[PDB]
């Protein structure tokens, strides 16, 4: 695995039982993200909502399809955050399904 | 008709294997049409004559290897028929008449394959 998150929160996912290779190195973590999924020698790759890639096309064109998922939303910090309910719901309705 | 009688003369009665090659059997059909309607007779093959049959019989049926002759009239018709319709008079009767056929199309003529 790898979880791709903030440096300090990336820290807590490198612990045993889990395998992380996080940290920020960009504002969408491109510096890392790209290089890492290119091999696809991690069981799971996950990109948080404290980064999240504004061009998802960038990744798809480089990995060249994947049977394992990518960019699973994790919050990426704690501040009592739970806006990732309604945010993900609308993330869905904008690109697919019905409008508003 | 005229040409084919000079086939009969040289394949059969002077024993040589003569290849006859007939082309522009659409320009044939132009002239066939003329007599079709300008004479008394009425159209009966979806706007072309009905004595058309005989006109494409007398032509094609002469040809054939005869048993006792060494020589032969091998006829190769080359059509040029309007568009790629198959209800058109020309490919109509011609199909039926001949045994074994060959087609050209536009699938392999966009590829440069001659």
């Amino acid at each position: 695995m790898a979880v791709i998150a903030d440096p300090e929160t990336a820290q807590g996912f490198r612990l045993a039982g889990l395998e992380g290779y996080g940290a920020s190195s960009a504002e969408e973590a491109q510096s890392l993200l790209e290089t890492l999924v290119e091999r696809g020698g991690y069981a799971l790759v996950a990109v948080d909502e404290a980064l999240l890639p504004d061009p998802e096309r960038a990744v798809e064109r480089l990995m060249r399809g994947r049977d394992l998922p990518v960019l699973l939303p994790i919050a990426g910090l704690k501040e009592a955050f739970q806006g990732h309910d309604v945010e993900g719901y609308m993330r869905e309705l904008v690109r697919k399904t019905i409008g508003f | 008709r005229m040409a084919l009688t000079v086939a009969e003369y040289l394949a059969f009665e002077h024993d040589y294997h003569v290849l006859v090659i007939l082309t522009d059997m659409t320009n044939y059909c132009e002239a066939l049409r003329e007599i079709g309607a300008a004479r008394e007779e009425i159209p009966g093959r979806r706007g072309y004559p009905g004595y058309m049959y005989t006109d494409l019989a007398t032509i094609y049926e002469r040809a054939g290897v005869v048993e006792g002759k060494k020589g032969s009239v091998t006829q190769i018709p080359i059509l040029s028929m309007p568009d790629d319709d198959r209800t058109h008079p020309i490919p109509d009767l011609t199909g039926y008449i001949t045994e074994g056929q060959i087609q050209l199309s536009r699938e392999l003529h966009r590829k440069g394959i001659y």
């Binding site: 807590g12 719901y89 399904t97 | -």
Partner: protein
């Protein structure tokens, strides 16, 4: 060049309308089913997510300046790392909307 005949083609083109209109009728309610249920999974998804995101992090973020030298200790007692080649359990499943694979972590 390529033009349609009339007599031969007629019978094909009348049954063309029979074939098309009916086919598309039921094609229509084929995907409709699947999207209705999809709302159910997207909503329900985030239920556990708010609950367990915060109680994971609870301890994490409170073990960063008491860690960086107790990092060693914590990783030792615990069960060693998940495999990087298929540590997750991948499932294959053929379904309408093409063959898409799933998985559970």
């Amino acid at each position: 060049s390529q033009v349609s005949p009339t007599r031969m083609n007629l019978l094909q083109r009348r049954g063309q309308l029979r074939l098309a209109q009916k086919g598309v009728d039921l094609l229509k309610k084929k995907r409709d089913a699947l999207v209705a249920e999809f709302f159910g999974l997207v909503r329900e998804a985030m239920e556990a997510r708010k609950a367990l995101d915060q109680a994971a992090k609870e301890a994490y973020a409170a073990l960063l300046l008491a860690q960086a030298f107790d990092g060693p200790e914590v990783v030792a007692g615990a069960a060693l790392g998940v495999p990087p080649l298929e540590g997750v359990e991948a499932e294959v499943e053929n379904v309408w909307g093409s063959k898409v694979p799933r998985l559970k972590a």
